[PDB]
Amino acid sequence: SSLDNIEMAYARQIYIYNEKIVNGHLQPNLVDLCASVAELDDKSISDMWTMVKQMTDVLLTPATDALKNRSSVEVRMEFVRQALAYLEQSYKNYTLVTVFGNLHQAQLGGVPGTYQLVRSFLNIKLPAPLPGLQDGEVEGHPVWALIYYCMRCGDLLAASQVVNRAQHQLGEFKTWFQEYMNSKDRRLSPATENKLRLHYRRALRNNTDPYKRAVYCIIGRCDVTDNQSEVADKTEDYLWLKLNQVCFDPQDRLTLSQFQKQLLEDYGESHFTVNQQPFLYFQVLFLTAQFEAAVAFLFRMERLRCHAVHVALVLFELKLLLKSSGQSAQLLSHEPGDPPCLRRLNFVRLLMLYTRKFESTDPREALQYFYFLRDEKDSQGENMFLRCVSELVIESREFDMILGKLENDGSRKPGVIDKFTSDTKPIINKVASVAENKGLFEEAAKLYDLAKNADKVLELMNKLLSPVVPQISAPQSNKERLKNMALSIAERYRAQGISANKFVDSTFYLLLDLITFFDEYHSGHIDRAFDIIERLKLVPLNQESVEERVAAFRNFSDEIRHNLSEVLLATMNILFTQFKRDRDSQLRSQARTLITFAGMIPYRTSGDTNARLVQMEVLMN
Amino acid sequence: FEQVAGSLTPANLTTAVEQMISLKYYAGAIQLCLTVAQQKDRGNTALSWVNDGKPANDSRKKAFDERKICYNLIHQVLDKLESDFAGEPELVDGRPTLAATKRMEAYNVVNDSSDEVFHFDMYEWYIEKGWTDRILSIDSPHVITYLQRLAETDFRHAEL
Numbered sequence: 203s204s205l206d207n208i209e210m211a212y213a214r215q216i217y218i219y220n221e222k223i224v225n226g227h228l229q230p231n232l233v234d235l236c237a238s239v240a241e242l243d244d245k246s247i248s249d250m251w252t253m254v255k256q257m258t259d260v261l262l263t264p265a266t267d268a269l270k271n272r273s274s275v276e277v278r279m280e281f282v283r284q285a286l287a288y289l290e291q292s293y294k295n296y297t298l299v300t301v302f303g304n305l306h307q308a309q310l311g312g313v314p315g316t317y318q319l320v321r322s323f324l325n326i327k328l329p330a331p332l333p334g335l336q337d338g339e340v341e342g343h344p345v346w347a348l349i350y351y352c353m354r355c356g357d358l359l360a361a362s363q364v365v366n367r368a369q370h371q372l373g374e375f376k377t378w379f380q381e382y383m384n385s386k387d388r389r390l391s392p393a394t395e396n397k398l399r400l401h402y403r404r405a406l407r408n409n410t411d412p413y414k415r416a417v418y419c420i421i422g423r424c425d426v427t428d429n430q431s432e433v434a435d436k437t438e439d440y441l442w443l444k445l446n447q448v449c450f451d452p453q454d455r456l457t458l459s460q461f462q463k464q465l466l467e468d469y470g471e472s473h474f475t476v477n478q479q480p481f482l483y484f485q486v487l488f489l490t491a492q493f494e495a496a497v498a499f500l501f502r503m504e505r506l507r508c509h510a511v512h513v514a515l516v517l518f519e520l521k522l523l524l525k526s527s528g529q530s531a532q533l534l535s536h537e538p539g540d541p542p543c544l545r546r547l548n549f550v551r552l553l554m555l556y557t558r559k560f561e562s563t564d565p566r567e568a569l570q571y572f573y574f575l576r577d578e579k580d581s582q583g584e585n586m587f588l589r590c591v592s593e594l595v596i597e598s599r600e601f602d603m604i605l606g607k608l609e610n611d612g613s614r615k616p617g618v619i620d621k622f623t624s625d626t627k628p629i630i631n632k633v634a635s636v637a638e639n640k641g642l643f644e645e646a647a648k649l650y651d652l653a654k655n656a657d658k659v660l661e662l663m664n665k666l667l668s669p670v671v672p673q674i675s676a677p678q679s680n681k682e683r684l685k686n687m688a689l690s691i692a693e694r695y696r697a698q699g700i701s702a703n704k705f706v707d708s709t710f711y712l713l714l715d716l717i718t719f720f721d722e723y724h725s726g727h728i729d730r731a732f733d734i735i736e737r738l739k740l741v742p743l744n745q746e747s748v749e750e751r752v753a754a755f756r757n758f759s760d761e762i763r764h765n766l767s768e769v770l771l772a773t774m775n776i777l778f779t780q781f782k783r784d785r786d787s788q789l790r791s792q793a794r795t796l797i798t799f800a801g802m803i804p805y806r807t808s809g810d811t812n813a814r815l816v817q818m819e820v821l822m823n
Numbered sequence: 824f825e826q827v828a829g830s831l832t833p834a835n836l837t838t839a840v841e842q843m844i845s846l847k848y849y850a851g852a853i854q855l856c857l858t859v860a861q862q863k864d865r866g867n868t869a870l871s872w873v874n875d876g877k878p879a880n881d882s883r884k885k886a887f888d889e890r891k892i893c894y895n896l897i898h899q900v901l902d903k904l905e906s907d908f909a910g911e912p913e914l915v916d917g918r919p920t921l922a923a924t925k926r927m928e929a930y931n932v933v934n935d936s937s938d939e940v941f942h943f944d945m946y947e948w949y950i951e952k953g954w955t956d957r958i959l960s961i962d963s964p965h966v967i968t969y970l971q972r973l974a975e976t977d978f979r980h981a982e983l
Contacts, residue, residue: 215910219907219908219909219910219911219922220907221907222906222907222908222909223847223903223904223905223906223907223908224844224845224903224907225903225906226844226899226900226902226903226906226907227902227903227906227907227909228902228905228906228909229904229905229907229908229909229910229911230906230909230910230911231909231910231911232908232910232911232912232922233911233912235909235910235911236910236912254912258912258913258914262913263957264926264930264954264956264957265926265929265931265933265934265957266927267927268913268919268923268924268927487917488917492917493914493916493917493918494917494918495916495917496916496917497915497916497917497918498916498917500916501916510915510916511915512912512915513912513914513915513916514912514914514915514916514918514920515911515912515915515920515921515922516911516912516913516914516915516920517912517913517914517915517916517917517918517919517920517923518911518912518913518914518915518919518921518923518924519908519911519912519913519921519922519923519925519926520911520912520914520919520920520923520926521913521919521923521924521926521927522913522914522919523914523915523916523917523918523919523920523923523924524917524918524919525918525919525924526918545917545918546918547916547917547919549918549919549920549921549924553921573846573847573921574847574920574921574922574924574925575921576847576848576849576925577847577849577850577921577924577925577928577929578921578924585846585848587846587847587848588846620845621845622845622846622847623842623843623844623845623846623847623848624838624839624841624842624843625839625842625843625846626842
């Protein structure tokens with residue numbers, strides 16, 4: 203097996219999600235089905251899916267195009283809020299593990315109020331007082347530190363409580379903050395927003411209290427260039443600092459498009475992967491709505507291929523992933539007729555790479571991933587899922603497992619693909635078609651016979667029999683192994699009343715009779731073998747039938763005319779033997795008949811055959 | 824199948840759709856059902872029979888029933904679609920997954936139809952399943968006009 207522990211667990215989860223859609227059940231939450239395995243690994247992966255769920259848990263317009271949802275200002279706004287809610291809660295967990303040694307340890311004693319937690323967080327991260335703080339303290343801590351880390355944790359209420367106990371010190375900041383907490387989308391009114399920004403810009407552009415600086419332009423979304431590096435030293439603190447500063451419809455203003463493009467264009471992977479920590483960059487791209495970038499990026503880490511494919515599937519089963527129309531493009535690209543700030547993922551290629559790894563010895567699991575390509579076609583019109591099953595069968599040669607083995611008793615035990623579509627007639631011909639083009643007739647027959655395509659089964663069975671008609675049928679020979687399959691196809695084609703056009707069909711049952719004629723001839727059962735050839739009315743034995751038999755030879759399958767030489771000789775040698783054992787006249791007359799027939803028929807080795815036939819007739823007299 | 828849509832029997836249609844559903848061919852399955860519905864009634868005897876209040880004893884009922892068998896099968900397709908992709912994300916690494924694109928491709932075929940009895944049957948279906956999500960988001964008056972007739976009749980419809 204080519205699948206690692208983690209990859210295998212995901213496969214099982216994707217089998218469920220397929221079993222549900224294959225039986226018409228409720229469309230379960232894919233993101234939940236993937237996070238179910240994440241908990242079996244380190245929390246590096248669990249915290250990823252947590253971000254994936256929260257970033258995709260946005261009210262969408264079902265049955266709407268992918269590009270439309272992702273271009274709409276409506277959806278683009280909720281992404282920023284879902285991310286900020288993740289950066290705030292994520293930071294809140296950092297504040298817990300900073301005070302208590304373990305999340306469990308914090309829980310048993312009880313998570314304290316965000317206010318008392320933050321206070322018990324300031325104790326550690328600033329034990330001694332910084333001399334540059336302003337506006338005094340509140341219950342033993344600087345008022346601005348409390349406000350910042352409370353807003354950072356996302357509890358505006360806890361921050362407003364701090365403000366209520368410092369009404370005299372904070373001046374007019376109270377009426378401004380109380381408006382920020384009330385107004386939605388973390389924005390103030392243009393009039394009041396103007397009043398505070400100008401005040402900050404007036405004489406507080408450079409204040410000795412960094413926490414004061416941070417809060418002001420987090421509330422006013424100002425000084426976008428100043429990264430407030432004094433308080434936002436971590437990467438998440440930067441993302442959170444900026445997403446609280448982005449704006450929507452000219453100076454000192456930043457928008458999501460600029461920010462998202464500004465980040466990866468100027469400070470690409472190189473900047474965010476110098477510490478050899480891959481998820482850091484992924485979180486930067488995913489929490490900025492650049493899902494295709496983050497997916498391709500994370501898909502290149504050979505250790506995190508599994509995770510990047512699935513986060514692509516989630517975005518794909520939620521009409522959020524922007525697929526690349528052309529299949530000839532690179533993995534990541536920007537369509538020419540699209541804005542430059544969005545990118546597109548060649549989803550078809552993405553799955554095709556992941557599959558090649560475990561498609562060789564783990565076919566069942568491969569199909570589960572090929573199903574997501576059911577909705578796509580290629581330039582030639584083939585259904586992508588169907589084509590992927592053809593290529594996977596041509597390579598793996600797993601016919602019984604994937605296509606269903608058709609035993610020699612008339613049964614068709616369904617295969618693994620039967621689960622996904624009930625119309626399995628084309629691919630069985632596709633797989634049968636190539637194997638036919640590769641001279642693998644004995645297989646192409648079994649495959650064509652699996653799809654009950656007798657036109658092709660009998661055609662190929664005619665080719666495999668004609669060479670072996672006069673041969674000696676011996677144990678385990680190529681004659682027995684082909685005759686016995688032909689008879690197993692004759693019964694199942696009569697018991698089920700199946701037949702190809704009379705040309706293909708007539709020749710097929712005719713060869714089977716001839717194969718019996720030589721099997722009796724090679725055994726010495728002369729009398730019995732003579733009777734068979736007489737029924738077939740293939741070789742004339744009375745002079746009257748020569749005219750009609752000669753005309754019939756003209757339109758009989760060349761697989762029959764080929765073996766005419768051996769038939770005449772065996773029949774002659776049959777009469778020849780019976781002569782040495784009135785009757786003499788009758789054999790003599792029949793001997794003549796064979797000669798005149800052979801004389802009027804142009805066929806294989808007519809030279810040596812016509813001569814031998816004449817000699818055997820002379821010895822009779 | 825589409826070339827012989829008008830001749831397809833309920834047994835052959837059902838089996839076909841089911842097989843297509845199993846192979847993740849949702850859009851395709853839906854497109855066949857719509858085509859079959861339109862071919863078994865090109866005069867729209869069904870649309871007029873519904874616009875006339877569905878008078879019992881009338882012989883358009885047959886025409887309406889042959890379309891309802893197609894519409895039901897469409898419900899099964901969409902049902903099995905959300906089921907098969909329950910838990911699957913709509914976006915991975917940024918761009919859309921394959922499970923998402925099949926959802927869009929399927930629902931496209933739905934919103935791309937001009938079969939009116941079909942869209943009525945779908946409004947009723949959305950209401951049934953409880954999807955105030957999508958129905959209140961149509962925009963179209965067609966759905967308003969449809970409700971204006973069915974309002975004085977049912978509480979749930981009047982609320983919509």
